[PDB]
């Protein structure tokens, strides 16, 4: 399989430059594109055989790439540049493909996670399962990365995150959830929780006590 | 000038089938190449299908090839995506897009598209579940007591503390969409470890669609 490797979250203020890559091993033979997705909005073009640009993008988003690595460069940030940007392109025989996508947010005072790690109640593990809840409140601006780590050793089967949520407070408010068997949770010796938000890594842990 | 209007999409149940329809505007279909790419409530964007104008070639996703089939009526510019032995993983908003036609195949216009749920999820009320801390946590001026609200449907799930008299420090997270189709959410309330176990903290879990009320105290 194959990825485009693009960072999750990019945050700038009004009126500067934002840069948002997108990393790959066949990008050197295929052409890169990029596609702006407002929050509840079909995605849309802004860039395309790596520096090509629409006739109803603005000047400012400026397509570029280089070897394994193409670059959404995003100058005089607005506000309604605010929204997720996805890299398009292709494996070594067609098939496209899609990066991760990327976060980009823009302006108000920048603020770290509120993280909480909860371990399985006994209660609930009477009922067969386990449950560790992972809550993430009081961020800005509204993006956040959530990890898991079973014993230091990352895990992704049972993890279901929430979408960051704005709080009455204008700060935002993110869950997750790491579903165990009443086995796994008492299998490991300790569960842990990292979320990462603007390079800041927050990482609380529990473990079966 | 260039339109896409997707439809179909609704809600069906594991195994069932669906046949969704992009009709076009504005542009001879029978000129482009058209692909369907789809994405799940707060994923990326992934993709399933391209075919050729003429339909001589179709191109699927490993994830869906063999139950998805594309076809096409350039007549009638319209493109169909019938997906059949639905998976919950095929839930997802589904985006048809007119692929360009320069550098590899990247789309340049794509039509708001049709979301397709696919559960089972009927009417489960909520489990409810204390959250505190083991030995570190408690040890705080100032720990952090909840409520786990796990395992619901449908929406939306009200909670509230010593029956509405507690506000202050209440902080009752947005329902996560676990992959069984059922809704979950936390909801803690930060008190002081000092005066703790002295005072009373219970949420009172109210969800009407299920006419069901719990009132859980959670202790230190
Ligand atoms: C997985 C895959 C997807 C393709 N998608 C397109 C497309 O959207 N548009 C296009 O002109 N060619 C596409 N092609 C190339 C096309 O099949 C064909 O080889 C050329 O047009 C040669 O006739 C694709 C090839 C593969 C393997």
């Known amino acids: 399989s194959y990825e485009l490797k693009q960072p999750p979250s990019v945050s700038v203020s009004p009126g500067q430059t934002a840069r948002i890559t997108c990393s790959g091993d066949?990008?050197?033979?295929?052409?890169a594109y990029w596609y702006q997705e407002r929050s509840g909005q079909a995605p849309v073009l802004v860039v395309y055989?790596?520096?090509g640009r629409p006739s109803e993008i603005p000047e400012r988003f400026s397509g570029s790439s280089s070897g394994t690595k193409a670059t959404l460069t995003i100058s005089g940030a607005q506000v309604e540049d605010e929204a997720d940007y996805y890299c398009?392109?292709?494996?070594?025989?067609?098939?496209?493909?899609f990066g991760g996508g990327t976060k980009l947010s823009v302006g108000q005072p920048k603020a770290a996670p509120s993280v909480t790690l909860f371990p399985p109640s006994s209660e609930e593990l009477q009922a067969n399962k386990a449950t560790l809840v992972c809550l993430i409140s009081d961020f800005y601006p509204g993006a956040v990365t959530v990890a898991w780590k079973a014993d230091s050793s990352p895990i992704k089967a049972g993890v279901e995150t929430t979408t960051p949520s704005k709080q009455s407070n204008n700060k935002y408010a993110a869950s997750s959830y790491l579903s165990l068997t009443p086995e796994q949770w008492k299998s490991h010796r300790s569960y842990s929780c990292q979320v990462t938000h603007e390079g800041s890594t927050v990482e609380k842990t529990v473990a079966p006590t | 000038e260039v339109q896409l209007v997707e439809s179909g999409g609704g809600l069906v149940q594991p195994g069932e089938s669906l046949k969704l329809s992009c009709t076009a505007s504005?542009?001879?279909?029978?000129?482009?190449?058209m692909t369907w790419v789809r994405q799940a409530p707060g994923k990326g964007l992934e993709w399933v299908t391209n075919?050729?104008?003429?339909?001589?070639?179709?191109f699927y996703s490993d994830s869906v090839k063999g139950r998805f089939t594309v076809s096409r009526d350039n007549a009638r510019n319209s493109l169909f995506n019938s997906m059949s032995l639905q998976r919950v993983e095929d839930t997802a908003t589904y985006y048809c897009?007119?692929?360009?036609?320069?550098?590899?195949?990247?789309?340049?216009?794509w039509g708001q598209g049709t979301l397709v749920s696919v559960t089972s999820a009927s009417t489960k009320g909520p489990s409810v579940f204390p959250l505190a801390p083991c030995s570190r946590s408690t040890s705080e001026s100032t720990a952090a007591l909840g409520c786990l609200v796990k395992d619901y449907f449908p929406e939306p799930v009200t909670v509230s503390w010593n029956s509405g008299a507690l506000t202050s420090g209440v902080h009752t997270f947005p329902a996560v969409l676990q992959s069984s189709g059922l809704y979950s959410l936390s909801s803690v309330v930060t008190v002081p470890s000092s005066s703790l176990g002295t005072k009373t903290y219970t949420c009172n879990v109210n969800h009407k669609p299920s006419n069901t009320k719990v009132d859980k105290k959670v202790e230190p």
């Open positions: 897009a007119r692929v360009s036609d320069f550098g590899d195949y990247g789309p340049d216009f």
């Open positions: 504005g542009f001879s279909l029978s000129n482009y190449y």
């Open positions: 075919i050729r104008p003429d339909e001589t070639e179709k």
């Open positions: 066949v990008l050197p033979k295929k052409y």
């Open positions: 055989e790596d520096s």
């Open positions: 398009y392109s292709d494996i070594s025989n067609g098939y496209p493909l």
